[PDB]
Amino acid sequence: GCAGKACNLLGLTCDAGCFCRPDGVGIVAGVCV
């Protein structure tokens, strides 16, 4: 539950432990879990 706003699977920008998850299949944009 470290969804600050959004997270692109082109790096990292989520709290330690919360992996950056993409929206779905074939999508680079997503949000921190």
Return the domain boundaries, the chain.
1-25
The structure was resolved experimentally with: NMR
Contacts of 9 (CB under 8 A, 6+ apart): 20, 21, 22, 28, 29, 30
- Residue labelled with tokens 């432990």: 17
13: Cα within 13 Å, side-chain hemisphere: 13
- Burial class of 23 by CB neighbour count within 10 A (0 to 12, 13 to 18, 19+): middle
d(CA 26, CA 2): 23
CB atoms inside a 10 Å sphere around CB 25: 5
Task: Give the 3-state secondary structure of residue 25.
Answer: coil
Closest to 14 in 3D by CA, of 24, 4, 23: 4
